[PDB]
């Protein structure tokens, strides 16, 4: 039932603005209260209406409205339930593994101060193999975390099940986290008939491919470059597309992700030894 009025003149006193806002907005209907919350240019007014019909009239009619010489910006003041709906409504079904924002990284926002790595593993290990978890502090205290899984499906499942669920006193705000750019591309969804020849030749369009590491039991591959920029181009240009001849999932792979990938191939008996790498080891021993 309130509106929020921004871009008020800094030379006016709080009282002047309070009285002015009241006088201006009472024209739309009965006004319940007017509050000024400073200061300077973050200074804004709240005008509360008895009837929501009046609030709507005032919002609709005050687009590009001049007030005390200023083109004020006036928006609905969001009540707690509407905001909860805003901040927690069911995710759009368009959001799946192939969405341009989808990554292997779960953003976990709204953490409480006391949040521990053990808590996060306890809730989020159910949705997939965790590669790493990084809790970050905002202004000094834990506020959010990046939790990286081995694939994208796991992030989607975690979001679906846990978004808006409480952890301690706080509702989790889950989403796709951006992944830090690296020089290594990760691909998922490759048929076992895809050849290394094809992958190397295809990804060479983005720059010289240092090597490809194809886990053919899992249908995943690393495509490694010597430049972060090439991997960035490969990721960006591959995101929408088919890599022969299936819609592919694609992300960056950081060091921890690569290590997990290699271990997994070793455990399954797939060779990860590389030509140029052995040559290097030969070089050192000389």
Swiss-Prot record:
Question: Which first-to-last residue range defines the signal peptide?
Answer: none
Subcellular localization is given as: Nucleus
Q: What induces it?
A: By 17-beta-estradiol.
* Expression sites by tissue: Expressed at high level in brain, testis, spleen and thymus. Expressed at intermediate level in kidney, liver, mammary gland and skin.
Q: Where is the RRM domain?
A: 1-81, 104-179, 183-255
What the entry says about domains is: The RID domain mediates the interaction with nuclear receptors. The SPOC domain, which mediates the interaction with NCOR2, is essential for the repressive activity.
Q: Which disease is it linked to?
A: Radio-Tartaglia syndrome: An autosomal dominant neurodevelopmental disorder characterized by global developmental delay, hypotonia, mild motor difficulties, impaired intellectual development, speech delay, craniofacial dysmorphism, and variable behavioral abnormalities.
Tell me which family the UniProt entry assigns to this protein.
Belongs to the RRM Spen family.
Subunit structure, as described in the record: Interacts with MSX2 and HIPK3. Interacts with NCOR2, HDAC1, HDAC2, RBBP4, MBD3 and MTA1L1. Interacts with RBPSUH; this interaction may prevent the interaction between RBPSUH and NOTCH1. Interacts with the nuclear receptors RAR and PPARD. Interacts with RAR in absence of ligand. Binds to the steroid receptor RNA coactivator SRA.
Please give the function described in this protein's UniProt entry. May serve as a nuclear matrix platform that organizes and integrates transcriptional responses. In osteoblasts, supports transcription activation: synergizes with RUNX2 to enhance FGFR2-mediated activation of the osteocalcin FGF-responsive element (OCFRE). Has also been shown to be an essential corepressor protein, which probably regulates different key pathways such as the Notch pathway. Negative regulator of the Notch pathway via its interaction with RBPSUH, which prevents the association between NOTCH1 and RBPSUH, and therefore suppresses the transactivation activity of Notch signaling.
Q: What is the protein name stated in its UniProt record? A: Msx2-interacting protein
- Organism (species): Homo sapiens (Human)
């Amino acid at each position: 039932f309130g509106i929020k009025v921004q871009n008020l003149p800094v030379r006016s006193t709080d009282t002047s603005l309070k009285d002015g806002l009241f006088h201006e907005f009472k024209k739309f209907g009965k006004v319940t209260s007017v509050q000024i919350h400073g200061t300077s240019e973050e200074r804004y007014g709240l005008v509360f209406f008895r009837q929501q019909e009046d609030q709507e009239k005032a919002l609709t009619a005050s687009k590009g409205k001049l007030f005390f010489g200023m083109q004020i910006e006036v928006t609905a003041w969001i009540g707690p339930e509407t905001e909860s709906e805003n901040e927690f409504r069911p995710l759009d079904e368009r959001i799946d593994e192939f969405h341009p924002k989808a990554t292997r990284t779960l953003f976990i926002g709204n953490l409480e101060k006391t949040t521990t790595y053990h808590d996060l593993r306890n809730i989020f290990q159910r949705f997939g193999e965790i590669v790493d978890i990084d809790i970050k502090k905002v202004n000094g205290v834990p506020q959010y975390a990046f939790l990286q899984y081995c694939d994208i499906a796991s992030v989607c499942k975690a979001i679906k099940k846990m978004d808006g669920e409480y952890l301690g006193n706080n509702r989790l705000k889950l989403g796709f986290g951006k992944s830090m750019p690296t020089n290594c591309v990760w691909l998922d969804g490759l048929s076992s008939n895809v050849s290394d020849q094809y992958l190397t030749r295809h990804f060479c369009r983005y720059g010289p491919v240092v090597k490809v590491v194809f886990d053919r039991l899992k249908g995943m591959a690393l495509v490694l470059y010597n430049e972060i920029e090439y991997a960035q181009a490969a990721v960006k240009e591959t995101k929408g597309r088919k890599i022969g001849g299936n819609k592919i999932k694609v992300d960056f792979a950081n060091r921890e992700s690569q290590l997990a990938f290699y271990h997994c191939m070793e455990k399954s008996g797939q060779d990860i030894r590389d030509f140029y790498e052995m040559l290097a080891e030969r070089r050192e021993e000389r």
